[PDB]
Amino acid sequence: SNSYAEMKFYVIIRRRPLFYAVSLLLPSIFLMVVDIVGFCLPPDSGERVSF
């Protein structure tokens, strides 16, 4: 005995994976290659551990 009218609007939005790209993957690979540089340090030095 009581019916109401609905008009739905589905707004569909997609994110732009650019601002979150650099801010995420770049520092990770940076510290990664810095660690790779860190392997070149001889175990005898001792500064490798602190590295």
């Binding site: 070149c40 340090l41 001889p42 005898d44 030095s45 500064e47």
Partner: peptide, 30 residues
Amino acid sequence: VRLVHKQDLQRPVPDWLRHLVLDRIAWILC
């Protein structure tokens, strides 16, 4: 720092001894 260290191994190769301690030394001195 990998180059200069006491690891009780090896000897300086003459081929790269002349290239660095002789030639590059004169090149750097000037």
